[PDB]
Point group: C5
Chain length 257, copies 5
Amino acid sequence: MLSAFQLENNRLTRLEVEESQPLVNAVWIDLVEPDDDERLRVQSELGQSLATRPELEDIEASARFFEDDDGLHIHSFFFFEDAEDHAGNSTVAFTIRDGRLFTLRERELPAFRLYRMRARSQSMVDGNAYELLLDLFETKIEQLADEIENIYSDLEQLSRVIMEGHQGDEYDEALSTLAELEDIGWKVRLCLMDTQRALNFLVRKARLPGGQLEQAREILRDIESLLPHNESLFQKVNFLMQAAMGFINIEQNRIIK
Amino acid sequence: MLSAFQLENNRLTRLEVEESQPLVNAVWIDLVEPDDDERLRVQSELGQSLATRPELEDIEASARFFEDDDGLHIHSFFFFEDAEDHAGNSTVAFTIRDGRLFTLRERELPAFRLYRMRARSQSMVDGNAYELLLDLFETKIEQLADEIENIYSDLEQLSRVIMEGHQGDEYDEALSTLAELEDIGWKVRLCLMDTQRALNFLVRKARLPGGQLEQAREILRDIESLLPHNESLFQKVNFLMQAAMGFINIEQNRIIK
Amino acid sequence: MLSAFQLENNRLTRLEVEESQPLVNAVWIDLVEPDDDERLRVQSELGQSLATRPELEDIEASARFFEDDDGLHIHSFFFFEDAEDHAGNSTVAFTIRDGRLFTLRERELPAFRLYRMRARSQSMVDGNAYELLLDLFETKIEQLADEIENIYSDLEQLSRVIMEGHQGDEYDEALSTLAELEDIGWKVRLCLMDTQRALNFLVRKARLPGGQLEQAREILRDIESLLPHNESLFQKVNFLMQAAMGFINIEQNRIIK
Amino acid sequence: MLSAFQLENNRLTRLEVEESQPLVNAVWIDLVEPDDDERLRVQSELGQSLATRPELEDIEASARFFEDDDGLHIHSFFFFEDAEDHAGNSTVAFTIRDGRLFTLRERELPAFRLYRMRARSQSMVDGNAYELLLDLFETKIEQLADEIENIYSDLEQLSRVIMEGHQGDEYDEALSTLAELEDIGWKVRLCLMDTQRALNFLVRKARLPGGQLEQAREILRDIESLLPHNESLFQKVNFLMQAAMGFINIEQNRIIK
Amino acid sequence: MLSAFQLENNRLTRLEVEESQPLVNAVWIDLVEPDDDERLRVQSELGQSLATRPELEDIEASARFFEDDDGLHIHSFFFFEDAEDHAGNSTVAFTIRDGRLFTLRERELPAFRLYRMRARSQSMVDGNAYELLLDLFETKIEQLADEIENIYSDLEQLSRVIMQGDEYDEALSTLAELEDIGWKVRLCLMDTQRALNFLVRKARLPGGQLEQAREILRDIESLLPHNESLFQKVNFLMQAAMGFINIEQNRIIK
Ligand SMILES: [Mg+2]
Ligand SMILES: [Mg+2]
Ligand SMILES: [Mg+2]
Ligand SMILES: [Mg+2]
Ligand SMILES: [Mg+2]
Ligand SMILES: [Mg+2]
């Protein structure tokens, strides 16, 4: 799946690619699960080699944040929910070269789907690959903050089930919920920590235009403010786990009598 | 619910608003669950758009602490107890523009009720929106310190109940109490951490008059001194939880014999 | 209970007060649970208002370490054991004004009782309110170190009971002891952390004579050296708790067979 | 087992040693479980004493990272899996002297086997003992990152077994798996922490050619980026352990009824 | 028990003290559980008052690392095993005054026995009280590292045991014994670290000694993390075992 976009008065406009062949006009090429036809197309029409599937699995800093003849690379985790409502992080490879952004990903993602909806009716400022990459990160952070906001309200409800329920039915269900919330928080944190590394890397490496620099700093400031929330949930979740076991042991004593 | 206040020799005096229409004389406009009539009134009489309900839910730094054409914004958690004695944090949107403070909130709050009682018979110093915002924060911290002081004495009593035990139904009751105290501490900490971000933001952003700057620093110094107390209570609470489970297991062994 | 002391060749000498009325000659006035007669006496004979009972309950920094027209104030936790051998921390309000020290406290305290015994036959160096305040702190630290030393030996003995006992009688008793030791350590730590704040405050605030400054630094160095011991005991205590539960579960399995 | 290598246009080429005796041409001598014949050979043909078996067991810094008349020594843990699929760390003694690298090890190791396979068809840059040592470390890190990547996917699967399963068969198996994953992470961390010390030592000690210095820094940057992942897995593992016990206690209550 | 040593070409040689009375020639006086005769002897023959029994119990920095008219004092924990193989830390009072080292201790200790064995047949470098004190510390650290090395291999074996029986009472006991050793090893390290930081700032240590002290500090910095790593493992194993016991209990009930 190849989509391509070009700039028209600081507005991202979707190029037609199946028909209008010239990719050279694009500022952003976005690949989703691309076949070897789409990869070869990008290879010949632009200069661009793209990361292979197994190289997006690598977690080492030097494998994720680096510069080479193929440009500036940032591999970042993006958060999503699979078909059965289970959280995950999918790695996305960002590459910037000759003022163009390339995004390569294994799947559809809510930050991208959201950015693209908005991009249809919203001007960029400086209008360049770096602003665009940071815009995708801004959107990612906005969505992680929503996730956290939801863990809070779910944990609030679940806290009351744990104080007020005693049946076994309500309690199997409670530990499962707790475990699902821990997992989301955990994945959210991986997502934040990685974005944070990525942004620190760019601040030191790219000659980011000054408008971009402030933007990146704003994003770093948001991450600094969400991480503590993450840690706060893990304390609550662990405490609730402990309390439940307490209630189960008390119940068991009742039963034995 | 719209209340408005004005200054008379550095004393906050309540304006009559249902009758005396001129709001322009007010230094502080305080809205509680305002209908669209009250919002429109503020909009036309002063320049002021106010945050919507869903924007007070956003927890990201950039959504809470920011400057724009509508002024300087600080969204801060305030602590309260709902009808059934369950702790919570309610977000309050502070806005300062043209030397006036606007507070927008979802509910009545004890810090506000307390500040207002005192404001009746107590002079301000410099007499301005920034002092006023910091006064509300001073008051908030004073109350969070009281909360913590109370968790201490409650935990002290509950500690003794747990050493006797010697179980039914003194022990169901003991874990419930523990769990209520953990939750208050937890919510107190969120409240402190957020006030701390807000105050760090203001120290860097507003041209705070020097009298205000010291005031802000004093409040930050207090938060620095309360956070450790918070962390201390979690250690105790977690240990007590562990001990109780110990006593329950010992009891269970007795029963089985 | 009002006692007063005066200096005679750098020696603190108890000046009889029921008879010899002139309090002006005293360097140190020490009140324990003073009635309104003793408070009024200090108020009229010296310039001195004294903190009320509820103000000694406040735990925020600005309520404990501050300067005002009534002088320099330090409120510090002191460690003690109540009638039923339960550890506690009692707040003592220190005030220095016009070269005189005022101590106000709710109860007898072992540091004070000890300092006073020694003061009968021991010269001070510079002979002033600040030295005197730091001497009381030195004594406090000496006693907290003794507490910790004792938690170690008690925990050593209890460690052996936990490996070698199996009866239920010996194990109720073991968890209780553990819980008692955790509580002492916990209260010791609060006592240290607070003294540490107090001393940091003085180092920056009072024009401490240079002999006093070194003294304060020595005390801070001691606290830096006791805090780690405190943290070490919590690890042990927690581990022992876990082991005991292990033994109880093993025992329970034996019983069921 | 003695292997030796020499440089030919920055390409490591395996010398024949059973036949072609001259070892003086080698840049790298690699010993695996060497007999006293192979040790004596290295001793006489080059100047080189080699660490004894018990000296590779010493874990203090001064025993692992040091310079002496026999050259520059680095003893580093390398990760492996024994015959029964149990993780372990084997110490390898690196020595550099007169532009030659000596590696002494107790066993075959996957980093070495991998480096050697690649070395057959891949040019070095500067072509020296220090580059070579850092290449082996680069390889080691690449493999530790693979390990961590695998703990993640295994923990992902195991997380779902723990939420969905009730049978005892699936749960014995689940704790065992958890315990195996904890042990790998644990050993991976020891391996990283030690490599980190080693590289910090070299950065301060060897006159590393500038191309090597950047290489070492790149490796340090990767370790800084993997350690947090390690800590993240322990939190998950510990939580899952707790949850499982919860489910077992719930099951036990069912059984008793 | 009074032993005394003197220097002969940078070699520590044991003086005869029951017979050859002159103590003034000694560089190192080592007392173990000394009676008031041996204390008075040191008091009169040299200038030296020695710490009392209860003052070696004090754990406050100011009670352990300090300078006064009786010289430079360092009280440090040393690791040992009592008669029933139970780990402990015994405080040793080091005092340096007029180029002489005094050690006062409650008991025999393996670092001291080891140092003395070696001191027979091994030259010192600069040959002074400060080198001698640091040599005793070097030896102490060498032994703590051995302890940790052993907790590792024991924990490795015990890990496998933990993956019906009488084997499980035994396993928790072993775990608890290993936790205790690690714990005591840490106390020993943390204290030595405080002592060495104190000396670096306080004594006019000759430059050869300064590097020596820094080497020792570097070793401690490298052992402490190992200590913390073992507690994580030990705590986890404890948790796992309880898991297995609960699973077993469920089997039984069925
Ligand atoms: Mg890889
Ligand atoms: Mg949102
Ligand atoms: Mg636990
Ligand atoms: Mg208060
Ligand atoms: Mg050794
Ligand atoms: Mg003492």
